[PDB]
Amino acid sequence: MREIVHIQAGQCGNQIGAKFWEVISDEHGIDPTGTYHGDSDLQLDRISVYYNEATGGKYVPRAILVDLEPGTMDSVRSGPFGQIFRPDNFVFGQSGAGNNWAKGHYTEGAELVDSVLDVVRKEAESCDCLQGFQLTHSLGGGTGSGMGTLLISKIREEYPDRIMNTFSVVPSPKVSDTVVEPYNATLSVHQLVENTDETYCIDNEALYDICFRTLKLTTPTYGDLNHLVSATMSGVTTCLRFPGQLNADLRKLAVNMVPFPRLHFFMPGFAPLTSRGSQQYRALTVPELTQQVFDAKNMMAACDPRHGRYLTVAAVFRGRMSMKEVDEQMLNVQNKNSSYFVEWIPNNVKTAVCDIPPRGLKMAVTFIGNSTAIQELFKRISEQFTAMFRRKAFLHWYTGEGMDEMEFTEAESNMNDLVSEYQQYQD
Amino acid sequence: PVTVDSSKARTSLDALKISIRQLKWKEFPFGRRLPCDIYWHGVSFHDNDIFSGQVNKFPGMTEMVRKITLSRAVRTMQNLFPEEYNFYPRSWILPDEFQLFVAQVQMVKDDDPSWKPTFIVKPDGGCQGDGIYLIKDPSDIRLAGTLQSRPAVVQEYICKPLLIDKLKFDIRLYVLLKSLDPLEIYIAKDGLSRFCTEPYQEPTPKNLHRIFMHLTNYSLNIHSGNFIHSDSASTGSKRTFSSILCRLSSKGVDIKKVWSDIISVVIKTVIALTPELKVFYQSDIPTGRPGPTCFQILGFDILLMKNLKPILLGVNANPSMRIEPSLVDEEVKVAVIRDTLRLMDPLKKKRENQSQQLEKPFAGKEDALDGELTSAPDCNANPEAHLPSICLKQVFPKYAKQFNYLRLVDRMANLFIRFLGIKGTMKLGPTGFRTFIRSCKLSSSSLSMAAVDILYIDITRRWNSMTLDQRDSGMCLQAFVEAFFFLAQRKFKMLPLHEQVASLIDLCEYHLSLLDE
Numbered sequence A: 001m002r003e004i005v006h007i008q009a010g011q012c013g014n015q016i017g018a019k020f021w022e023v024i025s026d027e028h029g030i031d032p033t034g035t036y037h038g039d040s041d042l043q044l045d046r047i048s049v050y051y052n053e054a055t056g057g058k059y060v061p062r063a064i065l066v067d068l069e070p071g072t073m074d075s076v077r078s079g080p081f082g083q084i085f086r087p088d089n090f091v092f093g094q095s096g097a098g099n100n101w102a103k104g105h106y107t108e109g110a111e112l113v114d115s116v117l118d119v120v121r122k123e124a125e126s127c128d129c130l131q132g133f134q135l136t137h138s139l140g141g142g143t144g145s146g147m148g149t150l151l152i153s154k155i156r157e158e159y160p161d162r163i164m165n166t167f168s169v170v171p172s173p174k175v176s177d178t179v180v181e182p183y184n185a186t187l188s189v190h191q192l193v194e195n196t197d198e199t200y201c202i203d204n205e206a207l208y209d210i211c212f213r214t215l216k217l218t219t220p221t222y223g224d225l226n227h228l229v230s231a232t233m234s235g236v237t238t239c240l241r242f243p244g245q246l247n248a249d250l251r252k253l254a255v256n257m258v259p260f261p262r263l264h265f266f267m268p269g270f271a272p273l274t275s276r277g278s279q280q281y282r283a284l285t286v287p288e289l290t291q292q293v294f295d296a297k298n299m300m301a302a303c304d305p306r307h308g309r310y311l312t313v314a315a316v317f318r319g320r321m322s323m324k325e326v327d328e329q330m331l332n333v334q335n336k337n338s339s340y341f342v343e344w345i346p347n348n349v350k351t352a353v354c355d356i357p358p359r360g361l362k363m364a365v366t367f368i369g370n371s372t373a374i375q376e377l378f379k380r381i382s383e384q385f386t387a388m389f390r391r392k393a394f395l396h397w398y399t400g401e402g403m404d405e406m407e408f409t410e411a412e413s414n415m416n417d418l419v420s421e422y423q424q425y426q427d
Numbered sequence B: 001p002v003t004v005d006s007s008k009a010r011t012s013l014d015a016l017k018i019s020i021r022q023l024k025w026k027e028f029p030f031g032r033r034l035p036c037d038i039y040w041h042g043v044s045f046h047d048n049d050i051f052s053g054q055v056n057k058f059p060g061m062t063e064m065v066r067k068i069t070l071s072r073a074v075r076t077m078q079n080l081f082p083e084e085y086n087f088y089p090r091s092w093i094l095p096d097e098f099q100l101f102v103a104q105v106q107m108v109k110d111d112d113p114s115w116k117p118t119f120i121v122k123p124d125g126g127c128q129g130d131g132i133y134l135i136k137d138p139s140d141i142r143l144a145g146t147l148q149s150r151p152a153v154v155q156e157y158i159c160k161p162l163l164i165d166k167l168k169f170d171i172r173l174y175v176l177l178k179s180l181d182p183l184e185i186y187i188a189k190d191g192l193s194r195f196c197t198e199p200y201q202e203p204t205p206k207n208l209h210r211i212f213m214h215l216t217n218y219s220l221n222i223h224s225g226n227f228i229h230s231d232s233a234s235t236g237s238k239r240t241f242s243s244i245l246c247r248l249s250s251k252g253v254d255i256k257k258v259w260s261d262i263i264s265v266v267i268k269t270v271i272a273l274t275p276e277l278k279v280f281y282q283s284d285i286p287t288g289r290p291g292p293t294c295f296q297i298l299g300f301d302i303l304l305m306k307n308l309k310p311i312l313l314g315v316n317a318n319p320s321m322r323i324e325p326s327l328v329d330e331e332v333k334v335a336v337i338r339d340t341l342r343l344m345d346p347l348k349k350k351r352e353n354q355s356q357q358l359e360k361p362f363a364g365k366e367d368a369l370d371g372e373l374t375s376a377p378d379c380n381a382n383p384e385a386h387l388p389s390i391c392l393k394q395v396f397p398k399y400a401k402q403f404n405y406l407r408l409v410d411r412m413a414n415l416f417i418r419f420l421g422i423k424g425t426m427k428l429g430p431t432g433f434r435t436f437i438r439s440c441k442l443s444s445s446s447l448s449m450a451a452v453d454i455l456y457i458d459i460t461r462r463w464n465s466m467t468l469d470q471r472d473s474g475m476c477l478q479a480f481v482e483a484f485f486f487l488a489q490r491k492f493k494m495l496p497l498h499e500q501v502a503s504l505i506d507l508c509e510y511h512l513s514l515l516d517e
């Protein structure tokens, strides 16, 4: 019951999804060969959410892996937790779309969305009662942004009732490995406004800040960042897998999280996070957990929440805790930091609680916050886009694939429209 | 010579062929690879992939002539113009409007105990009279079975029609739609009168099952033992409409007024049904892309009441053009197709332009010298001089005084495709509505963006649930009409409905003119 279809596109999406499947398979007691070796019965009671049951009690993850360059696919296959994905679930192309939004969305990636949709339909009909689709991709590339927008649109055209939550990586101001990435980012925000229900924003600058400050790690590679993203991904859908006292699913989160249809650009966080040389000098209690989750530094988006007002926040505790502590502490959060919440909506906090904690831990929290400061995360992009428009640069690589100039202006204007919408309610 | 493709003519093949031979046009019975001047399809516009030329099928007319769509358009217009659109008896769509039908019947019965109405139930997809029956009470509807999932139409039955030889008859009239922009409608001077095989009586519970005396369908009456096949145009179960009109005039009935109101109801149906055709044309043939021109022949079914008030029954996008031989059917249909083809000869416009260009006088430098006995041959023979006169009279689409205020939904239909976008998708998304609101400046302190979004969501949900298919991703044209009606109700309070909608259209047009300027 309540099955979730997973889609990965692009290099970042593929790597984050690989880490995510490794993380979940550890929690449900799945071996890298597919067999179940676990200690608790509860793990194998809702394995139908993420896994299909094949013969010989071997569980195949319900994931679809797409990209326009074959090489990355091999990287997924020849890795840990790699011979579990279905061989026919790897849909791939020949050339990796460069950094062209137009190539992925229009010319070379259009001859692959048909196969992806075929696999999507095949997976979606062997499910008892579908709950939604979740997709991991990275705005700023060619296959990620373009193929993800095309796929998302073509799926909401066919399933305009399910929940589409997207875990997307947004361009950062300091870290930047591309020169035409603002173009792709601007061309995609527009499609994410009217085709997704939840949009979790991630930037590599924030993850690097977390790995440098909170954890104090010497050489933080992409593995740690993918690990944190997998942690927050697993934490959101926990009240569908394990049992608790205040269970809240994706639709309940959306209802309590989105006051206006265009206002669904959240920002994530994961509470229990310490170094390896400090786990003994700190007590793992509910007060400490809720103090770390609302810390400005401990936020996986490069926007300062102090510059805006939280529209609404949802927290999903996992472990064995008393309701009174949770309610009292996350009421006291909104009496102290009172100026950081809007006033027209009282009780700006949603609380869920799942009994089973993550493995190796006792209590953990996943934080999802909708606040106006996310406008900055888009505002910067517009500025960059503007600087690349009046002196039209690298536009021939985009206009040579059928994209007209008017599309750029329309997408940009839609971006400022969303920014203005986020801004007006803050004042 | 004009090339005509008749590979998909079907029942219109033979009647076309002689017509093709009457115009000395040369045919492709099996088609060709190269583009053809005129393509003649029988059922669907999507029969062949046509990129240029002319096609005898407007896009989507199969769906429009369906009973529920025509009924929806008729009720929309009746809301817009009740008095004008009274020719269509009140209708309900099952199973969606069953409760409303029951409540209305109960309230009218309570108001008038002596009221004994008769209703007729017709399937949407049913043709040739199949599935059509008569009821006297809403409880008489057969609601137990697996056949009730199909949408149906319950209509007020005309219990008092005109009777000729004690037989109730209907009229099938052939109407030509030449173009949608500009609108051009032509009406044939003669039609086919189909008569019942049994004497007509007022509907009673004892004779509801008698379909022969209550249904004028040719396919149903042909199996009756009382059906008479006659070669004369004034006898038999199938006759010429001109003969019936002349018999009526023989009793002192003003046939000119009768013809005028037939023309009025035909034009009213066409205008009421046009805007969805413009939407479908934009969806299927986008502006700026190569595409063929379109026209259509429609079979209008009219029941002539004893008080000479017409009633529009069924409408058919694909009327039976088969002439088998039947003298009346041939004489009507072959002439209809011949006039149709003559009206749209691709060289007529070129010939007219050349004649107009050749008539420009060259004035200047007069100087005369003698010339002797050079007789110019009479090289101006009309190629159509041997053809009979066209019976599809050029009834003025620009009736003005007769028909100028009827263009209301058609007038505002362009607003839908203005914000449609790229690729001509059939539906309009929330961004389209919000851009429309921000463009025509309908938003204010009273109506903020949240209210607009709530209205859009509610209307879209209602119209998606209304249709048989539950997806309906987006907004159709009828939902846009409902939204425009609500917006026009909000503005210009304490004003008549005709003044409303029109005033909002004027304001929106003014704001648009400011925007482009």
Ligand SMILES: CC(=O)O[C@H]1C(=O)[C@@]2(C)[C@H]([C@H](OC(=O)c3ccccc3)[C@]3(O)C[C@H](OC(=O)[C@H](O)[C@@H](NC(=O)c4ccccc4)c4ccccc4)C(C)=C1C3(C)C)[C@]1(OC(C)=O)CO[C@@H]1C[C@@H]2O
Pocket: A022, A023, A026, A027, A215, A223, A224, A225, A227, A228, A230, A231, A232, A234, A235, A272, A273, A274, A275, A276, A279, A358, A359, A360, A361, A364
């Ligand atoms: C010596 C010791 O105590 O090591 C612990 C540990 O508790 C620490 C170091 C862990 C450790 O995490 C990290 O050091 C880390 C570094 C970079 C990126 C991500 C993680 C740990 O890796 C993480 C790991 O946590 C889990 O097992 C959770 O279940 C977590 N990860 C996995 O299940 C998992 C499975 C397979 C492979 C890798 C991780 C999780 C939490 C929520 C939802 C899903 C998964 C644990 C107990 C440890 C180590 C091993 C050092 C921490 O784990 C998290 C992310 O909550 C980091 O801060 C917490 C708490 C501790 O300080």
Ligand SMILES: Nc1nc2c(ncn2[C@@H]2O[C@H](COP(=O)(O)CP(=O)(O)OP(=O)(O)O)[C@@H](O)[C@H]2O)c(=O)[nH]1
Pocket: A009, A010, A011, A012, A013, A015, A016, A069, A096, A097, A098, A099, A138, A139, A140, A141, A142, A143, A144, A145, A169, A177, A204, A222, A225, A226
């Ligand atoms: N947090 C992470 N960011 C990543 C990872 N891999 C790539 N990236 C970042 O994502 C951004 C986009 O690079 P990708 O090559 O993944 C984007 P895409 O696959 O859509 O591009 P093409 O394959 O060239 O079409 C860029 O800033 C990378 O540094 C990863 O594993 N984790």
Ligand SMILES: [Mg+2]
Pocket: A011, A069, A096
């Ligand atoms: Mg790549």
